[PDB]
Amino acid sequence: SLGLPEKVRACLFDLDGVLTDTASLHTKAWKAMFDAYLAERAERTGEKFVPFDPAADYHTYVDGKKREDGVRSFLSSRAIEIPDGSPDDPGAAETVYGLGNRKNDMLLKLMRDDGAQVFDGSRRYLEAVTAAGLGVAVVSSSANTRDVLATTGLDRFVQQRVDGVTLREEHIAGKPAPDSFMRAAEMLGVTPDAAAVFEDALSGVAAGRAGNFAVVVGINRTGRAAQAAQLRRHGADVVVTDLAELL
Ligand SMILES: [Cl-]
Ligand SMILES: [Cl-]
């Protein structure tokens, strides 16, 4: 059954933290950027410095979202708003795009050091879904999704991709809007009531629920009950610590 109802004919996976062991790299890059930006703010304004919490702040405000939505959402949680700027703003600019580019510069530095690794259980699950003849899409906010799927070889399991480039070029609202999962379902030729969503991000689980997908599977690798509770509260039908728990 692969943990799925019989009506499910396709699986939609997030990338970082679901298929590849790359969520900690993104989290490190987000925290390092935001700590430096917030400390630089405190130097300018005299406001109290409060670091970026790589658990609660990442999971609530950043995880899964379009990069610039993650910037705006975390900043808003601190009662900070800055101009959006332009997509090619340098990382030194105090704009939403600038901070996103600053984080992306960080991420690429970390990624070139230690390349993306696949979770063994995720490889097993993709092999099982593929052997069962189910469609597979990857739906991620990360702009590097195509490259990650290529270097890991996971692209051999994936028929459709909606990633950070797709969101920008097709003007698709990111998670927690359901729109990017619905675009992937459409590319796969299935309706949401015939599709399963696999997500480690609270925003992504909420997107799956908002899209009325047949099953929303949350992934909790934190080892803490609190994130599993949040995944269920945000709309996950199933929570696993690893996809192999469904085999
Ligand atoms: Cl990105
Ligand atoms: Cl469960």
Q: Does 113 qualify as catalytic in the annotation?
A: no
Cis link prior to 87 (omega < 30° from 0)?
no
Q: What is the CA radius of gyration of the chain?
A: 18
> Resolution limit in angstroms?
1.7
> Which ligand sits closest to the CA of 30?
1
Measured in whole angstroms, the distance separating CA 52 from the mean position of its chain's CA atoms is: 18
Residue 57 annotated in ligand binding: no
Distance 218 CA to ligand 2 centre (A): 9
Please choose, from the candidates 104, 136, 113, 112, the residue with its C-alpha nearest in 3D space to the C-alpha of residue 123.
136
3-state secondary structure of 62: helix
Residue 115 annotated in ligand binding: no
3-state secondary structure of 43: helix
> Which ligand sits closest to the CA of 163?
1
The dihedral through the CA atoms of 172, 176, 180, 185 has a sign that is: negative
The dihedral through the CA atoms of 224, 164, 72, 54 has a sign that is: positive
**Per-residue burial over 21-48, b = 16 or more CB atoms within 10 Å of its CB, e = otherwise:** bbbebbbebbbbbbeebbeebeeeeeee
Question: What's the CATH class of domain 10-22+117-246?
Answer: alpha beta
CATH T-level topology, domain 24-113: DNA polymerase; domain 1 (1.10.150)
Distance 245 CA to ligand 2 centre (A): 10
166 φ/ψ angles, rounded to the nearest 5 degrees: -55, -45
Please choose, from the candidates 239, 191, 232, 206, the residue with its C-alpha nearest in 3D space to the C-alpha of residue 8.
191
Distance 162 CA to ligand 1 centre (A): 13
Tell me the residues surrounding ligand 1 (ion) with CB < 5 Å.
67, 142-143, 164
Please choose, from the candidates 152, 162, 159, the residue with its C-alpha nearest in 3D space to the C-alpha of residue 133.
159
Catalytic residue among 14, 63, 69, 237: 14
Distance 159 CA to ligand 2 centre (A): 27
Experimental approach: X-ray
Q: Does 14 qualify as catalytic in the annotation?
A: yes
CA 219 – CA 227 distance, rounded (Å): 9
> Which ligand sits closest to the CA of 142?
1
Residue 67 annotated in ligand binding: yes
Q: Which residue has the tokens 């975390």?
A: 74
All structural domains of the chain with their residue ranges: 10-22+117-246, 24-113
Please choose, from the candidates 139, 190, 198, 188, the residue with its C-alpha nearest in 3D space to the C-alpha of residue 165.
139
Distance 183 CA to ligand 1 centre (A): 19
3-state secondary structure of 217: strand
Residue 14 annotated in ligand binding: yes
Contact (Cβ atoms closer than 8 angstroms) between residue 21 and residue 243: no
Strand 215-219 versus strand 238-240 pairing type = parallel
Residue 212 annotated in ligand binding: no
Q: Which residue has the tokens 């993104």?
A: 26
Find the DSSP H helices in the chain.
23-45, 56-57, 67-77, 96-113, 120-131, 145-152, 164-169, 179-188, 202-210, 225-233
- Two structure tokens written together for 12: 């939609």
Contact (Cβ atoms closer than 8 angstroms) between residue 100 and residue 86: no
3-state secondary structure of 94: coil
